[PDB]
Amino acid sequence: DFEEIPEEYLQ
Amino acid sequence: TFGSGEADCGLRPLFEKKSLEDKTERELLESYIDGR
Amino acid sequence: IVEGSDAEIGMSPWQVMLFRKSPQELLCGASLISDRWVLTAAHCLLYPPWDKNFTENDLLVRIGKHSRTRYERNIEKISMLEKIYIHPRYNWRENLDRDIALMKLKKPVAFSDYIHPVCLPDRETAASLLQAGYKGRVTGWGNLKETGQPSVLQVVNLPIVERPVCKDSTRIRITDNMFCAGYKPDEGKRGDACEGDSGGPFVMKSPFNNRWYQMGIVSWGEGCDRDGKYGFYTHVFRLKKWIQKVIDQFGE
Ligand code: NA
Fold first, then answer.
1. C174 and C58, same structural domain?
2. Which of C28, C35, C223, C244 has the greatest count of CB atoms below 10 A from its CB?
3. C186 is catalytic
4. CB distance from C25 to chain A under 8 Å?
5. Would strands C201-205 and C212-220 be described as parallel, antiparallel, or unpaired?
6. Are residues C232 and C128 part of one domain?
7. d(CA A10, CA C119)
8. Active site residue C31
Protein backbone atom coordinates (compact mmCIF):
# COMPACT_ATOMS: atom_id res chain seq x y z
CA ASP A 1 0.00 0.00 0.00
CA PHE A 2 2.97 2.33 0.66
CA GLU A 3 4.84 3.71 -2.32
CA GLU A 4 8.49 2.69 -2.77
CA ILE A 5 11.07 4.99 -1.23
CA PRO A 6 14.55 5.68 -2.70
CA GLU A 7 16.90 2.66 -2.27
CA GLU A 8 19.49 4.99 -0.68
CA TYR A 9 17.37 4.93 2.49
CA LEU A 10 17.69 1.19 3.07
CA GLN A 11 21.26 0.35 1.93
CA THR B 1 15.04 19.42 23.09
CA PHE B 2 14.70 20.56 26.74
CA GLY B 3 12.72 23.01 28.84
CA SER B 4 10.23 24.95 26.88
CA GLY B 5 11.58 23.15 23.83
CA GLU B 6 14.44 24.17 21.59
CA ALA B 7 14.38 27.95 20.90
CA ASP B 8 12.08 28.55 17.98
CA CYS B 9 9.97 25.57 18.85
CA GLY B 10 6.19 25.54 18.73
CA LEU B 11 6.05 28.24 16.07
CA ARG B 12 4.87 26.56 12.89
CA PRO B 13 6.19 28.19 9.67
CA LEU B 14 2.92 28.27 7.79
CA PHE B 15 0.91 29.54 10.74
CA GLU B 16 2.38 31.34 13.75
CA LYS B 17 5.24 32.68 11.71
CA LYS B 18 2.64 34.19 9.29
CA SER B 19 0.08 35.06 11.88
CA LEU B 20 -2.32 32.57 10.18
CA GLU B 21 -4.53 30.24 12.26
CA ASP B 22 -5.40 26.65 11.37
CA LYS B 23 -9.14 25.91 11.53
CA THR B 24 -9.51 24.17 14.88
CA GLU B 25 -6.92 25.92 17.11
CA ARG B 26 -9.63 28.40 18.20
CA GLU B 27 -11.34 25.41 19.80
CA LEU B 28 -8.40 24.76 22.08
CA LEU B 29 -7.77 28.31 23.28
CA GLU B 30 -11.44 28.62 23.86
CA SER B 31 -11.26 25.65 26.25
CA TYR B 32 -8.56 27.24 28.41
CA ILE B 33 -11.48 29.37 29.58
CA ASP B 34 -10.78 31.50 26.50
CA GLY B 35 -7.49 33.07 25.42
CA ARG B 36 -6.60 36.73 24.58
CA ILE C 1 -7.68 8.80 14.57
CA VAL C 2 -11.44 8.05 14.81
CA GLU C 3 -13.82 11.01 14.13
CA GLY C 4 -10.92 13.31 13.36
CA SER C 5 -10.43 15.18 10.05
CA ASP C 6 -7.66 15.61 7.52
CA ALA C 7 -4.85 17.88 8.70
CA GLU C 8 -3.71 21.03 6.93
CA ILE C 9 -0.40 21.09 5.18
CA GLY C 10 2.16 22.29 7.75
CA MET C 11 -0.28 21.99 10.70
CA SER C 12 1.79 19.41 12.72
CA PRO C 13 5.39 19.96 11.44
CA TRP C 14 6.75 17.94 14.28
CA GLN C 15 4.79 14.82 13.40
CA VAL C 16 7.05 11.93 12.52
CA MET C 17 6.15 8.61 11.09
CA LEU C 18 8.17 5.58 12.21
CA PHE C 19 8.37 3.37 9.15
CA ARG C 20 9.76 -0.14 9.06
CA LYS C 21 12.03 -1.39 6.35
CA SER C 22 10.93 -4.96 5.59
CA PRO C 23 8.02 -5.21 5.35
CA GLN C 24 7.66 -1.50 4.56
CA GLU C 25 4.84 -0.56 6.97
CA LEU C 26 3.85 2.23 9.34
CA LEU C 27 4.56 1.35 12.93
CA CYS C 28 3.87 4.41 15.10
CA GLY C 29 4.03 8.21 15.05
CA ALA C 30 6.63 10.25 16.96
CA SER C 31 7.49 13.96 17.37
CA LEU C 32 10.57 15.93 16.43
CA ILE C 33 11.97 17.86 19.48
CA SER C 34 15.42 19.05 18.19
CA ASP C 35 17.14 18.44 14.83
CA ARG C 36 18.45 15.07 16.04
CA TRP C 37 15.81 13.74 18.42
CA VAL C 38 12.57 11.99 17.93
CA LEU C 39 10.30 11.14 20.81
CA THR C 40 7.92 8.14 20.66
CA ALA C 41 6.21 5.60 22.94
CA ALA C 42 8.42 2.75 24.13
CA HIS C 43 5.85 0.11 23.24
CA CYS C 44 6.45 0.95 19.51
CA LEU C 45 9.87 -0.59 19.86
CA LEU C 46 9.74 -3.14 22.64
CA TYR C 47 6.60 -5.15 23.48
CA PRO C 48 7.75 -8.71 24.49
CA PRO C 49 4.22 -10.19 24.76
CA TRP C 50 4.28 -9.88 20.92
CA ASP C 51 8.02 -10.36 20.56
CA LYS C 52 8.40 -6.77 19.42
CA ASN C 53 11.93 -5.49 19.95
CA PHE C 54 13.05 -3.27 17.10
CA THR C 55 16.55 -2.01 16.74
CA GLU C 56 18.15 0.95 14.95
CA ASN C 57 18.77 -1.10 11.81
CA ASP C 58 15.08 -1.84 11.48
CA LEU C 59 13.47 1.59 11.38
CA LEU C 60 13.37 4.72 9.25
CA VAL C 61 11.94 8.01 10.45
CA ARG C 62 9.92 9.95 7.85
CA ILE C 63 9.62 13.60 8.68
CA GLY C 64 7.52 16.05 6.68
CA LYS C 65 4.61 13.81 5.67
CA HIS C 66 0.99 14.57 5.13
CA SER C 67 0.16 11.52 2.97
CA ARG C 68 0.56 8.07 4.60
CA THR C 69 1.52 5.92 1.63
CA ARG C 70 3.32 8.36 -0.66
CA TYR C 71 6.97 9.17 -0.78
CA GLU C 72 6.43 12.98 -0.93
CA ARG C 73 9.56 13.56 -3.04
CA ASN C 74 11.20 16.93 -2.20
CA ILE C 75 9.00 17.47 0.86
CA GLU C 76 9.75 14.72 3.37
CA LYS C 77 13.10 13.66 4.74
CA ILE C 78 13.84 10.06 5.83
CA SER C 79 16.54 9.67 8.48
CA MET C 80 18.13 6.61 9.95
CA LEU C 81 18.63 6.13 13.65
CA GLU C 82 21.82 6.19 15.61
CA LYS C 83 20.57 5.19 19.07
CA ILE C 84 17.22 4.31 20.72
CA TYR C 85 16.69 4.82 24.39
CA ILE C 86 13.75 3.28 26.23
CA HIS C 87 12.91 4.53 29.74
CA PRO C 88 14.84 2.23 32.19
CA ARG C 89 11.54 1.68 34.04
CA TYR C 90 9.06 1.30 31.16
CA ASN C 91 6.67 -1.31 32.55
CA TRP C 92 5.43 -3.58 29.77
CA ARG C 93 4.40 -6.19 32.18
CA GLU C 94 1.64 -4.32 33.87
CA ASN C 95 0.23 -0.95 32.63
CA LEU C 96 2.65 0.63 30.12
CA ASP C 97 3.73 3.13 32.71
CA ARG C 98 6.77 5.23 31.59
CA ASP C 99 5.92 4.53 28.03
CA ILE C 100 8.51 6.82 26.45
CA ALA C 101 11.61 6.35 24.25
CA LEU C 102 14.05 8.70 22.53
CA MET C 103 15.68 8.05 19.15
CA LYS C 104 18.71 9.93 17.94
CA LEU C 105 19.00 10.36 14.17
CA LYS C 106 22.09 9.49 12.15
CA LYS C 107 22.54 13.13 11.02
CA PRO C 108 20.53 16.23 12.03
CA VAL C 109 17.52 17.24 9.97
CA ALA C 110 16.99 20.52 8.22
CA PHE C 111 13.71 22.22 9.19
CA SER C 112 11.50 23.74 6.51
CA ASP C 113 7.80 24.66 6.51
CA TYR C 114 6.98 20.96 6.82
CA ILE C 115 9.61 20.03 9.38
CA HIS C 116 9.89 22.15 12.60
CA PRO C 117 10.24 20.88 16.26
CA VAL C 118 7.71 21.16 19.09
CA CYS C 119 8.45 22.44 22.55
CA LEU C 120 8.68 20.18 25.56
CA PRO C 121 6.67 21.57 28.43
CA ASP C 122 8.12 23.39 31.48
CA ARG C 123 6.59 22.95 35.04
CA GLU C 124 4.65 26.19 34.74
CA THR C 125 3.09 25.42 31.32
CA ALA C 126 2.41 21.87 32.46
CA ALA C 127 0.70 23.21 35.53
CA SER C 128 -1.43 25.70 33.70
CA LEU C 129 -2.59 23.71 30.68
CA LEU C 130 -3.18 20.22 32.12
CA GLN C 131 -6.55 20.93 33.66
CA ALA C 132 -9.59 18.91 33.03
CA GLY C 133 -11.66 20.35 30.16
CA TYR C 134 -8.79 21.95 28.34
CA LYS C 135 -8.43 20.44 24.92
CA GLY C 136 -5.30 18.96 23.38
CA ARG C 137 -4.82 17.71 19.82
CA VAL C 138 -3.57 14.35 18.61
CA THR C 139 -2.50 13.47 15.05
CA GLY C 140 -1.62 10.29 13.19
CA TRP C 141 -1.96 8.05 10.17
CA GLY C 142 -3.52 5.42 12.31
CA ASN C 143 -6.76 3.65 11.76
CA LEU C 144 -10.07 5.41 11.39
CA LYS C 145 -12.24 2.81 13.14
CA GLU C 146 -11.49 0.12 15.75
CA THR C 147 -12.37 -2.38 13.04
CA GLY C 148 -10.57 2.37 7.02
CA GLN C 149 -6.97 3.81 6.99
CA PRO C 150 -6.54 7.46 5.87
CA SER C 151 -4.50 8.83 3.04
CA VAL C 152 -3.76 12.02 4.91
CA LEU C 153 -2.65 12.89 8.54
CA GLN C 154 -5.74 13.24 10.77
CA VAL C 155 -6.39 15.65 13.65
CA VAL C 156 -8.90 15.45 16.52
CA ASN C 157 -9.03 17.77 19.58
CA LEU C 158 -9.82 16.06 22.85
CA PRO C 159 -10.51 17.25 26.38
CA ILE C 160 -8.47 16.21 29.42
CA VAL C 161 -10.50 14.10 31.79
CA GLU C 162 -10.31 14.01 35.60
CA ARG C 163 -8.07 11.30 37.00
CA PRO C 164 -10.93 9.67 39.05
CA VAL C 165 -12.88 9.28 35.82
CA CYS C 166 -9.81 8.03 34.00
CA LYS C 167 -9.52 5.43 36.77
CA ASP C 168 -13.19 4.47 37.00
CA SER C 169 -13.27 3.65 33.28
CA THR C 170 -10.67 0.84 33.38
CA ARG C 171 -9.41 -2.05 35.46
CA ILE C 172 -5.78 -1.03 34.86
CA ARG C 173 -3.71 0.74 37.44
CA ILE C 174 -3.36 4.36 36.18
CA THR C 175 -0.18 5.97 37.62
CA ASP C 176 1.05 9.58 37.94
CA ASN C 177 2.81 9.27 34.60
CA MET C 178 -0.41 8.94 32.68
CA PHE C 179 -3.35 11.17 31.94
CA CYS C 180 -6.44 10.50 29.79
CA ALA C 181 -8.48 12.57 27.39
CA GLY C 182 -11.76 12.12 25.71
CA TYR C 183 -15.33 13.14 25.73
CA LYS C 184 -17.81 11.60 28.14
CA PRO C 185 -20.57 9.44 26.48
CA ASP C 186 -22.63 12.31 27.69
CA GLU C 187 -20.89 15.07 25.72
CA GLY C 188 -22.18 13.94 22.28
CA LYS C 189 -18.73 14.58 20.68
CA ARG C 190 -16.43 11.70 19.73
CA GLY C 191 -12.88 11.26 18.69
CA ASP C 192 -9.95 9.33 20.00
CA ALA C 193 -6.66 7.91 18.73
CA CYS C 194 -6.42 4.37 17.64
CA GLU C 195 -4.06 1.68 16.43
CA GLY C 196 -1.33 3.22 14.24
CA ASP C 197 -1.30 6.44 16.29
CA SER C 198 0.73 5.12 19.26
CA GLY C 199 3.87 7.16 19.86
CA GLY C 200 2.56 10.41 18.54
CA PRO C 201 2.16 13.78 20.17
CA PHE C 202 -0.68 15.22 22.19
CA VAL C 203 -0.09 18.95 22.00
CA MET C 204 -1.56 22.15 23.35
CA LYS C 205 -1.07 25.75 22.34
CA SER C 206 0.01 28.01 25.23
CA PRO C 207 -2.38 30.98 25.21
CA PHE C 208 0.53 32.79 26.86
CA ASN C 209 3.31 32.60 24.34
CA ASN C 210 1.50 31.19 21.30
CA ARG C 211 3.68 28.05 21.15
CA TRP C 212 2.79 24.42 20.86
CA TYR C 213 3.98 22.19 23.58
CA GLN C 214 3.82 18.46 23.59
CA MET C 215 2.21 17.39 26.84
CA GLY C 216 1.52 13.67 26.16
CA ILE C 217 2.38 10.72 23.89
CA VAL C 218 -0.30 8.25 22.60
CA SER C 219 0.24 5.22 24.85
CA TRP C 220 -2.79 3.03 25.11
CA GLY C 221 -6.51 2.66 25.43
CA GLU C 222 -9.05 -0.18 25.25
CA GLY C 223 -10.60 0.00 21.77
CA CYS C 224 -10.91 3.17 19.72
CA ASP C 225 -13.64 5.68 20.56
CA ARG C 226 -15.62 3.34 22.82
CA ASP C 227 -18.25 5.16 24.94
CA GLY C 228 -17.24 5.11 28.58
CA LYS C 229 -13.55 4.64 27.80
CA TYR C 230 -10.79 7.22 27.29
CA GLY C 231 -7.24 7.31 25.84
CA PHE C 232 -4.20 7.38 28.04
CA TYR C 233 -1.07 9.25 27.26
CA THR C 234 2.41 9.25 28.82
CA HIS C 235 3.03 12.29 30.99
CA VAL C 236 5.98 13.98 29.15
CA PHE C 237 6.53 16.67 31.78
CA ARG C 238 6.55 14.06 34.48
CA LEU C 239 9.31 12.22 32.62
CA LYS C 240 11.13 15.35 31.38
CA LYS C 241 14.18 14.96 33.58
CA TRP C 242 14.79 11.57 31.93
CA ILE C 243 14.56 13.32 28.63
CA GLN C 244 17.15 15.96 29.53
CA LYS C 245 19.47 13.49 31.12
CA VAL C 246 19.77 11.23 28.00
CA ILE C 247 19.97 14.23 25.75
CA ASP C 248 22.85 16.01 27.56
CA GLN C 249 24.43 12.66 28.44
CA PHE C 250 24.38 11.51 24.77
CA GLY C 251 24.18 14.66 22.53
CA GLU C 252 21.60 17.33 21.56
NA1 NA D 1 -14.61 7.23 24.61
1. no
2. C28
3. no
4. yes
5. antiparallel
6. yes
7. 30
8. no
